[PDB]
């Protein structure tokens, strides 16, 4: 029950309350085990606990799969430092240690509560009799699969062994499963559901993407006569919520070419607002020093270029549209990460859109020369372009592409606030283009 899971989390994670009500629901569903559950959260949201808690709650020896051995080691260490029973059947284990782990899994009453194994290990013939014995004795309480998005080629990560993990799910069908993912699109979610052969009735727990504190708005460089002045005005309005509050937060700007970021930073400094390029060409020491300077309030807005994170950032200017819509959302997430309100602004231009499309096509062709991933990234770029040109609720488009529940943003959305202005901007773009 609720008390049992709360006590288990206090003993393991030491959290007085769950990170999010979605985590409550996902953990309840996993503990119930009535059917599979597909739960997705961003990194750092304690998504692993959703399967760690029920795995220990159930008497059966739960088994989980993760792609990386560095990852598997990190989670095993994190569970060990919390006294949580855990083991790894990776090839790194010494011959004697590997045999001991195999015997412990094979023998009745496995000592390990949750056992992590790399996807290829489940395909290894050595573990086959072990899995047969566990399924015969229904020793596998739950079968969670970390990084479930790797099964789908459209996701940022792909692993050929997740196809075999699907067949493994086909085994021990009596026990349910838990599918984790950092960022899963509805197409990716459907692909994961179909490949893993999960029992069709599944409770999906995906965090909504709208940020009541965050605000979005798209701008057209051609429409604005002085885009630099518009950016300066946006920075001035964002760095201070009120006159008494004064300057607060930080700012970041992205670009594809280091020279572009250098020029943008030079222009910003000329205007009056301090800004450092922080581009890749800048040496490592200089880059980290610029990042540290931007962390404090000394630099109202420091150009980030390829990479930034920061606790609270007021805005994130996108002079050049991102390569992927999901990538753009992740870039904007660090903006306003704290509970304070934030304002996000894009700078979409036809020339920049064409340039990024050409670069993406060239990259896809190069990758194909050495196919599904190219199509997926092209689709992400097209979705980002549509978001830029979509004349409607921005959070609605974000939810549509990520497939999470649509938003109800009464305030904090440009389209929902002044739809007439959005229509006017769209008409202006159409006349210009």
């Amino acid at each position, epitope marked *: 029950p609720e008390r049992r899971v709360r006590s288990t989390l206090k003993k393991v994670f030491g959290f007085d309350s769950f990170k999010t009500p979605l985590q409550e629901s996902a953990t309840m569903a996993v503990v119930k085990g009535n059917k599979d559950v597909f739960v997705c959260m961003p990194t750092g949201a304690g998504k692993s606990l959703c399967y760690q808690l029920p795995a220990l709650l159930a008497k059966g020896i739960t088994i989980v799969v993760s792609p990386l051995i560095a990852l598997i080691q990190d989670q095993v260490d994190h569970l060990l430092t919390l006294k949580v029973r855990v083991s790894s059947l990776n090839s790194k284990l010494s011959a004697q240690e590997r045999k001991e782990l195999l015997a412990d899994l094979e023998r009745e009453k496995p000592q390990t509560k949750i056992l992590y194994i790399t996807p290829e290990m489940a395909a290894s013939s050595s573990f086959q009799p072990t899995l047969n014995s566990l399924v015969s004795r229904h020793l596998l309480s739950y079968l969670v699969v970390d990084e479930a998005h790797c099964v789908s080629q459209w996701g940022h990560d792909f692993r050929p062994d997740y196809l075999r993990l699907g067949a493994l799910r086909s085994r021990l069908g009596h026990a349910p499963c838990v599918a984790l993912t950092a960022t899963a699109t*509805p197409q990716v979610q459907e692909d994961v559901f179909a490949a893993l052969h999960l029992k069709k009735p*599944v*409770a999906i*727990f*995906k965090t909504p993407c709208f940020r009541a504190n965050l605000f979005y708005d798209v701008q057209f460089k051609e429409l604005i006569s002085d885009p630099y002045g518009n950016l300066k005005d946006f920075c001035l309005k964002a760095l201070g919520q009120e006159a008494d509050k004064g300057l607060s937060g930080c700012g970041i700007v992205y670009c594809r070419t280091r020279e572009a970021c250098e020029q943008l930073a030079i222009e910003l400094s000329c205007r009056g607002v301090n800004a450092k390029a922080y581009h890749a060409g800048l040496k490592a020491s200089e880059r980290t020093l610029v990042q540290n300077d931007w962390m404090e309030e000394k630099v109202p807005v420091i150009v980030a270029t390829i990479s930034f994170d920061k606790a609270n950032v007021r805005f994130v200017a996108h002079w050049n549209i991102a390569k992927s819509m999901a990538g753009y959302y992740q870039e904007s997430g660090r903006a306003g990460r704290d509970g304070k309100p934030s304002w996000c602004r894009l700078y979409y231009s036809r020339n920049d859109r064409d340039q990024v499309s050409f670069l993406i096509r060239k990259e896809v062709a190069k990758l194909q020369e050495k196919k599904a991933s190219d199509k997926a990234t092209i689709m992400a770029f097209d979705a980002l372009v549509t978001f830029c040109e979509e004349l409607g609720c921005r959070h609605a488009a974000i939810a549509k592409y990520f*497939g999470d*529940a649509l938003p109800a943003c009464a305030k904090g959305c440009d389209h929902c606030q002044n739809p007439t202005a959005v229509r006017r901007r769209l008409e202006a773009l159409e006349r210009s283009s």
Partner: nanobody
Amino acid sequence: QVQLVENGGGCVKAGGSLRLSCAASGSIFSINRMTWYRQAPGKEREWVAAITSGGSTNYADSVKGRFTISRDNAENTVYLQMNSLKPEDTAVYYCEAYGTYTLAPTGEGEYDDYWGQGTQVMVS
């Protein structure tokens, strides 16, 4: 939760025509594919046709000559158009909506498919 309902079921003479409409209830993002099924008293269920997102359609040659399916994801509604009806296709038509995907602000969802009540048809 999602609920399915049939609309436009009735017996007509040979060579007649009508439409069987199926919709959904609640908040649904997108159905993987809507798959009608024909099953009658004493008759085993048979895969009659199916429509998936993007416009791709699957069916049987005999049923193709008989009927034709077409659905819209935005409307989340699938229509089976009855034309040149014959007394052989007299089975109750159930609406599958294979691969339903539900969303809520709380984040809780449901991937299970929901089957409709359906309706039969007869011919002289």
